[PDB]
Structures are given as structure tokens and as C-alpha cells.
Design a protein around this ligand. Structure first.
Ligand SMILES: [Ca+2]
Ligand SMILES: [Ca+2]
Ligand SMILES: [Cl-]
Ligand SMILES: [Cl-]
Ligand SMILES: [Cl-]
Ligand SMILES: [Cl-]
Ligand SMILES: [Cl-]
Ligand SMILES: [Cl-]
Ligand SMILES: [Cl-]
Ligand SMILES: [Cl-]
Ligand SMILES: [Mg+2]
Ligand SMILES: [Mg+2]
Lengths: 469, 470
């Protein structure tokens, strides 16, 4: 029946995420079960189960990538036996008649379903992490380029001591370095369930090796090694602990806050006309639509993390099946969401448009109200009284403030100072006392050091993933 | 106003957590500010601000612990000058008159409020982690003790292939090892904001050192070193990134699931009469797993506190917005107090779990015959009989016995039916020793022993000094 007549999620269709979506597709699901069956037979034969023939293994080797027809045949078999794994065991054994006898030998259902999911989780991180690396790369190049450009600081979203455009971008950069840290940890923490049997005791395999514990341990480690994993969980019930889904998702939940804060900030800078999203195809009014989408999708990750926390919390004993439906939603959705976020942020950070003039206009309007201490010191320096000067400025500041709020014209405080005889000693020093570059503290130095050290050191292990456009 | 007449959070007035609650007390907040001012003064002197005097440093050193009188005098000033920190600078400098021109020199208010918060986060983790270590220690001793004891397994909470009591405990232990990993990471990831100025640019410290960047950098490094921290955040706005609060709470959120799953399993085992919570004070027949119920209750509360942190960081505009202040005042203390109560309670539970082997064994005996079909068939095949015939014969008796159990409420009589059926005569004398639960536990005892003596032992080795006895 028609796709136009059924709901489809956007993590899937509307936004380009072809590779990530493939990892969580049905074809990759069933193909990965076959890869697991192949390597279960290889390892079992090696460890000593002579019932497995090399010819069975060689057949399975040519049929790891399930075809549309086999999927449909497995669907027919599933509605008959009401078990998707056993349906695929049957169809795989039809395709590979020399292997029909030994496919799934000794294993329980979760041998293929659970190990496949753990494979997908690590494969998914290996898609995400190259994208995050490139976001860090493009934004830090941005930060360095603009390290010297003074910009109005904002606290409570009210005018605050000057920083620089590049320095502000290091805030977003620092959060993304913590994301690289969190994601790399989670990625390299993942192990495989291996062969564990129905309640984790490996009773079935112990029997198949006639009570030889060493053989069972050799099998468990070998099959995981063949799948390219270093870690096999030694103690499980039927399933890998669903607490692993929490710790796999916590870096995604944390990253959501990074993305939402970055995108919110840019949306405000777009309102201020200081920074806009990249040109895409010259309009006066432009919407920061990519950042609004980043906020939208980032916000969705919190509930998926709670899905995982609540699921693990009520897994009774060696497992309950109330993990199954929700995991088919929460795990793909979370990685697809972050995949879309990172690709969008990569598009945004590749071509941020800066308007230094708008930036300078805004600074000019606000800085005189923040330059009181400079005006005071400069007059004391010239022999004036400090409080006498502190009172004279407050008079002019209130007048300027009234002109801004009370009347609506441009801040005229500097003009007022040039018109007040008291301040004559500094009339030719007001350009210097109001020079924005003198107000940005260490913001340029902080930025250069952070890009050149923190960011470079963090990205050095992933240099091979850094691309261009 | 009387304390009986106002709401008090049970996280500080109902459960034992003196130490953790003191970390988040008013006195420790204001005393930590003073500790921050003392080391700010020491660091500024070493880097070259002679305006502060050696006498001031020594006088601040025996007034770091604020008195109730000073707290009260700081409160009379906070109402007057509309600001807590300045009010405490004043009182500290009245209490310490040779440091009064020197306290807070060059710093902004977040130098004390924000650095103190980070100190409390790591100090709080240093309270939690030793309790976690000891929970792991007691429960792993339990798992080893019961590594051999066969127990009905449960999937879908229906009878499943036998495991052992100790092996089941290794599921909880493995989760706790991940909690140790997560918490130790978060604990050691924490740095200090240091001295950063109102927007993170250190403009006022750069001005105070007449433009010497190296002195600003070395001041930032040294004040943080004096407080016992190796990491100083190089790039901030007004404050440390609130994303740090998320990454400090995510191990606590994850641990909430460990605690809830552990305590839910024990409450089910208590229903089954297999395992009960420790005796307190002629034992009562019926006992409630009330400590486990409390663990589930408080564990559940951690999820919302983590969401507090996620959403807070998400909407921090630019160099800071002050919608982080009130909520962080709830979420950070509540989360560490909740996990502290959870660990104390779990330590008490796991120190004296009560196991009833004959209830466990009675349950296995009633279920194992239905699970031993293949074993009975293999026994007949090994006498020389037919797998197909034996399969059908046992299928008939199994359905009769199932009907007795469910339709009649009777004891499972499958074994008696077998011994009563002429077809099964070749295996009559094999049934008793066949149905031996010790032969059905697979590798559960060996898995348990290896896990405790390798994975657990290795995880706890760096923390041996924290292991205590009762
Ligand atoms: Ca071959
Ligand atoms: Ca051995
Ligand atoms: Cl195909
Ligand atoms: Cl098994
Ligand atoms: Cl298995
Ligand atoms: Cl065996
Ligand atoms: Cl959209
Ligand atoms: Cl500061
Ligand atoms: Cl400053
Ligand atoms: Cl309670
Ligand atoms: Mg001039
Ligand atoms: Mg009876």
C-alpha cells in the first residue's frame, strides 16, 4: 500500500541522512543477522564443532546481503511461525542448503538481534564522530579568523563588557570538545553480547562442547573478535544490559544542549543583524531557518534519553520484553536526530556571514555607557578630581540615557562630553578612550590559544576525517 | 519562624546525609567564598600585587569558617546593599580589617559563587564514590558467596533456564561498575572557572596587571592550583558552561536506572520469599522490602533533575542569562543528596541480604520438570529408545501435569506421571538424579567467580583505601 497514505517520520525521509538511515534499515538488520550466523559458524568450527562444514560456511559467505525476495519470503514465514529470527533462519537455510543444518546452532534469538543492535550503535557513532570533527574544524577556523573582531558582550541579554566574535565562538567550541570527549568514550565503551544462551548461562554451548568451559570462553571471544569488537560482556542475562542504551545515549542528550545553545545564540545574532546563516542558492530580511531546525530537533533528544533511563529501570531479572518496541524507536531516532543536527551545523558553520559594521554600530551605541571608568581615570590622570569627574559624567549619562529611552535618538553621550567645558582635557582623547579594541581584555589571546592548543590537540587523532568542500 | 511551620525537603530533613547536606549548606557556601578570597590573595601576591599584605593573608586564615553572627551580619547588609557577595566581602573585611582593602581585589562576583559551585560538585562526588565502592564490595562478596546456588531464571517474569543467586547479582554489579566508570570520569573532568571577569575576557585583571597577559594567565593557573584543581577552563563567558552541569549529572541519571532495577528485582525476590532485606533488631513471617521501595522512589526523581540541566544549558544566551540561578539551586544539591541517600540505603541493603535456599529450591522443583523435556528425551535415547516416540509420550504427560497445575491448583506431578507410565520404565530410576538443578545452571558459577575476582577486583583496586567494614 502507498507511502503517501501512511505516516513517515522525518528522521528518515525529509532530511538527508542516507548512511545513518541505512544502518537502521530492515535490509541491514537481516543482513547483519546473516553476518552473525556466518561468524558463529566460523568460530564454532574453529573451536571444535566438527558438524559445521567449510562448504556451509562458503555458501553463507555468498549470501550475506539479503535480497528483496528473501525479505518477502521471510515475511511469509514469520506470519506463519510468529518469530522473525526463526523465519530468517528458515529462509537463510533455504538460500544456503549446505548450512541449513547449522545456522544458529546453539544460539538463542538475542544472539542475532542484540549483537546486531550493538554493532549498529557503534557503526552509528562512527558516522556521527567524523561529522562532529568537521564541525569543530570549520567553527574553529571561523573562531581564529574573527579572534580580533570586537563585539558587544551580553549578560542577561543586556549590554556587557566587550568580547570578540571569535572568542564567543570558542564557547560553542568548548561545548563541542566535551561532546567529542563524551561520544568517543561511549563509542569505545561498546562491547558485544556474544554467545550467552537464554538466560546468560551459556548452558547450551557448554553442552555442545561436552562440559568444556574453556571452549565456550574461546567461542565467545572468537565470535566477537571476528565481528571486529575488543570487548565481550562477561555477565549478562538473556540480553545486553539496557543500562548500555542509557550510556550510549547520554552523549547525544548532552550534545542536544550544545546544539540548542549554539543555534539559539545564532538566531539572536541574526535578529541583531550581526551574523547570518550561509547564503544558499541578496535579501535584506533573512530567516535563520537552519538554526531553528537545529533547536527543534535538539529538543527532541531529551525524551529519547528518558525512554532509555526508564526502560533499564524496570527490566525485571534476566529480561522483560517491554524493552523491545521502544528500543526500535528510541535508538534509531536518537542517532538519526544527531546525524541531522551535525550535518546541519556543518552547513551553518561552513559559511557564517558576519557584518562587522552592524557590530560596530551596536558597540558605538552602547560603549559610552560602559566607558565611565576610562573617562574618569583619564581626567584624574590630567589632574582632575575623581568624584568631581564621576559626578560630571553621571549628569551627562542620565541626559544621554533620557535621550535614548526617554527620547529615541542616537546615544549622544560622547557629543555631550565634547560640549561640556569640564571635560576639555580629554576632548582629543575620546577617540582613544572609546576605541573598542582597548576594551576586549584577553579575548583575542584566549581564542588563539584555544584553537591552536585545545582544539588542535583534540582533533589530532581524527585528522584523517577532516574534509573540505 | 518555627521549622515545624514550613516545608522542608525530605532530602535534607528526613534521611541521613549529614556530610553531603553540609556541602550544600549556607555555612559551607560562605566559608568557601572566604577560602576563595584567601587563595585569590595568595595568588595575587605571588604574581606581583604587593598592595595586599602578608598580615592580611594570615588574618584571613583563622576566619575561613563563618560564624552564625557573621552570617547574620552579612544578612543585615545584603538587605541594605542588594547583593550577597559584596555583603560578605564587607563582613569578612570587618572581621578581617587588615584584609578589608584586599578581599575580592580585581574579581567579579562569580569568582566566588561559581568556583564554589564547582568545588561542591567535585567534593560531592568524593562523598558518593567511596559509598559506591563499598556497595560494589558488599554485593560482590554476596555474589561470590552464592555463586553456586541454583535459582529459577526469569524472562518475561516467566520460568526460564536456571541461573544462580550470585550470577544474578553480577548483573547488578556490572551496572554498578559502569556507574563507577561514569562517576569517576565526571569527577575528574571537573575544572575551575578561575578568574575570568564579567564576560570571560579577564579585562579587569589585564588592566590590573598593566597589560601583562602572562601574569593574568599565571594568576588564573595558581588560584586554581591552590584550591586543589588541575584544570582551569580557558574559555568562558561570565561563568562555567552550564553544559558542565549536564555532564556532571548524567552519571547520576544513569545510576538511577541501576538502583531502580536492583531494587525492583529485590522487591520481586521478596515477593517470591527467596531474598529479603536485612533483619533490623522471632522473625516476622511477612516482611516488606521498604528500603528497596525507597530506593526506587528516589532513583525515579533523578530523571527530572537531569532534564533541568539539559534545558538550562540549552537556553543560556551568549555570555550568561540568569535563568540558571534558581533552578541550579534546586537541581544540583537535590541530585547529589538523592544519590547519596540511594547509596547509603543500598549499602545497608547489600550488607545483609537474607537468602532462603529451601524456598528457591521448592520453586525450582515445581518448574524444572516442564523445562527438562529435552533431558528426559535424551535419557531415553541413551537407553536405546526413539526420540520421536519419547517426544510424543512426554508431550502427553506434560499437558496432563500442566492441567493439574493450572486447572486444578495442584502440585506439579509430571515426574510422578512419568514414573507411573510403562513407556518410561527404562528411565524410571534415572529421573531423580536427572532433575538435579545443579546440572542446569550452565556456566553461571564460573561466570560469577571470574567476574568478581577479575572485573570487580580490578575496578576496585584503585579505591582499596575506601573499603570499610561494618
Ligand atoms: Ca573456506
Ligand atoms: Ca579452564
Ligand atoms: Cl534485492
Ligand atoms: Cl542456554
Ligand atoms: Cl546465544
Ligand atoms: Cl553440560
Ligand atoms: Cl524545519
Ligand atoms: Cl573573576
Ligand atoms: Cl573583566
Ligand atoms: Cl520511604
Ligand atoms: Mg585623538
Ligand atoms: Mg504440597
Amino acid at each position: 500500500m502507498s507511502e503517501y497514505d501512511k505516516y513517515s517520520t522525518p528522521l528518515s525521509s525529509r532530511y538527508a541522512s542516507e548512511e545513518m538511515s541505512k544502518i537502521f534499515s530492515l535490509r541491514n538488520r537481516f543482513s547483519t543477522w546473516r553476518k552473525l550466523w556466518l561468524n558463529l559458524a566460523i568460530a564454532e568450527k574453529e573451536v571444535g564443532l566438527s558438524v559445521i562444514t567449510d562448504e556451509a560456511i562458503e555458501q553463507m559467505k555468498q549470501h550475506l546481503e539479503i535480497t528483496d525476495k528473501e525479505i518477502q519470503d521471510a515475511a511469509v514465514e514469520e506470519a506463519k511461525v510468529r518469530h522473525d529470527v526463526m523465519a530468517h533462519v528458515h529462509v537463510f537455510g533455504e538460500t544456503c542448503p549446505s548450512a541449513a543444518g547449522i545456522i544458529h546452532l546453539g544460539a538463542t534469538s538475542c544472539f542475532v538481534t542484540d549483537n546486531a543492535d550493538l554493532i549498529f550503535l557503534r557503526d552509528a557513532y562512527d558516522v556521527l564522530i567524523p561529522k562532529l570533527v568537521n564541525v569543530i574544524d570549520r567553527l574553529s577556523k571561523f573562531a581564529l579568523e574573527y579572534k580580533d573582531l570586537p563585539v558587544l558582550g551580553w549578560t542577561h541579554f543586556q549590554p556587557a563588557q566587550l568580547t570578540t566574535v571569535g572568542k564567543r565562538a570558542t564557547l560553542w567550541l568548548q561545548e563541542l570538545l566535551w561532546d567529542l570527549r563524551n561520544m568517543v568514550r561511549a563509542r569505545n565503551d561498546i562491547g558485544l553480547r556474544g554467545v550467552k544462551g537464554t538466560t546468560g548461562t551459556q548452558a547450551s554451548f557448554l553442552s555442545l562442547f561436552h562440559g568444556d568451559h574453556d571452549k565456550v570462553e574461546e567461542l565467545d571471544k572468537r565470535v566477537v573478535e571476528l565481528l571486529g569488537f575488543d570487548i565481550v560482556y562477561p555477565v549478562t542475562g538473556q540480553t545486553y544490559s539496557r543500562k548500555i542504551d542509557i550510556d550510549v545515549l547520554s552523549p547525544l542528550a548532552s550534545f542536544g544542549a550544545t546544539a540548542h545553545k549554539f543555534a539559539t545564540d545564532i538566531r539572536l545574532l541574526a535578529n541583531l543583524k550581526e551574523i547570518e546563516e550561509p547564503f544558499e542558492k541578496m535579501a535584506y530580511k533573512r530567516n535563520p531557518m537552519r538554526c531553528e531546525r537545529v533547536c527543534s530537533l535538539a529538543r527532541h533528544l531529551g525524551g529519547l534519553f528518558n525512554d532509555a533511563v526508564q526502560t533499564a529501570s524496570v527490566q525485571w531479572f534476566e529480561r522483560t520484553l517491554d524493552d523491545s518496541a521502544i528500543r526500535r524507536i528510541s535508538l534509531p531516532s536518537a542517532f538519526l536526530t544527531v546525524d541531522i543536527l551535525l550535518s546541519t551545523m556543518l552547513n551553518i558553520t561552513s559559511g557564517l556571514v558576519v557584518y562587522p559594521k552592524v557590530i560596530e554600530r551596536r558597540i558605538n551605541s552602547e560603549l559610552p555607557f560602559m566607558a565611565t571608568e576610562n573617562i574618569i581615570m583619564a581626567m584624574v590622570e590630567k589632574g582632575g578630581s575623581r568624584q568631581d569627574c564621576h559626578e560630571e559624567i553621571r549628569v551627562l549619562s542620565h541626559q544621554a540615557s533620557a535621550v535614548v529611552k526617554q527620547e529615541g535618538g542616537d546615544n549622544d553621550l560622547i557629543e555631550r562630553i565634547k560640549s561640556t567645558e569640564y571635560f576639555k582635557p580629554i576632548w582629543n582623547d575620546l577617540d582613544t578612550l572609546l576605541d573598542p579594541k582597548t576594551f576586549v581584555g584577553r579575548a583575542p589571546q584566549q581564542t588563539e590559544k584555544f584553537v591552536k592548543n585545545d582544539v588542535a590537540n583534540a582533533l589530532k587523532p581524527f585528522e584523517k576525517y577532516i574534509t573540505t568542500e
